[PDB]
Amino acid sequence: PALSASSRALIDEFMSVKQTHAPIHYGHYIIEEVAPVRRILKFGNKVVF
Amino acid sequence: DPTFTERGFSKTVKSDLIAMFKRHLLEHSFFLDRAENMGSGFSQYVRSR
Amino acid sequence: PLNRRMQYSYYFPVGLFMPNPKYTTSAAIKMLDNPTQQLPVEAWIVNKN
Amino acid sequence: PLNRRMQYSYYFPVGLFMPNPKYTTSAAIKMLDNPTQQLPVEAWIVNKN
């Protein structure tokens, strides 16, 4: 499963804290990035692993 | 690094190397400002670069 | 020849829909519309850049 | 002549506007205004000093 979301809101939630974020909002949702290559994701200075 | 190159100088290899330039302009230039703010790996970082 | 190329197949959905008991797991994001009648129209995925 | 002069061009917008599904990210900041209709009219940036 690739990293997808619904709007930019859950993306910039998941970029804020990668541990305690929402995978499922009210109708919205965001599927986390699990892969053989665990990619670096940069959004400004917020950058997760 | 000939990993990227010597495969055939197409549109595609250079159109990926441009994003490689964009990614390496942030994490590997002005290394001394990193190393004066990095952790205990001071000397090995400068030796790596 | 040790610089092989693996070809992984990623996938992601778009435009799904939650079942009617809708919940949330983050006390930060509150969308500014009626959240019950909400469904995504799109998907925002991240690139290699 | 090692005192070279890199001229990194910066850029920043002013006057941009969110799309109509509006939302929040951090819920510990409030404004005394009707939150739905508001516009970023000025931009604050940070100088060298």
Curated annotation (Swiss-Prot), chains C, D:
Compartment(s) where it occurs, according to its Swiss-Prot or TrEMBL record: Virion; Host nucleus
Coiled coil, from the record: none
Superkingdom of this protein's organism: Viruses
Functional note: Self-assembles to form an icosahedral capsid with a T=16 symmetry, about 200 nm in diameter, and consisting of 150 hexons and 12 pentons (total of 162 capsomers). Hexons form the edges and faces of the capsid and are each composed of six MCP molecules. In contrast, one penton is found at each of the 12 vertices. Eleven of the pentons are MCP pentamers, while the last vertex is occupied by the portal complex.
Protein family (similarity comment): Belongs to the herpesviridae major capsid protein family.
Subunit structure, as described in the record: Homomultimer. Makes the hexons and eleven out of twelve pentons. Interacts with triplex proteins 1/TRX1 and 2/TRX2; adjacent capsomers are linked together in groups of three by triplexes, heterotrimeric complexes composed of one molecule of TRX1 and two molecules of TRX2. Interacts with scaffold protein; this interaction allows efficient MCP transport to the host nucleus. Interacts with capsid vertex component 2/CVC2. Interacts with the small capsomere-interacting protein/SCP.
Name listed for the protein in its UniProt record: Major capsid protein
Species per Swiss-Prot/TrEMBL record: Epstein-Barr virus (strain B95-8)
Parent-protein residues present: 396 to 444 of 1381
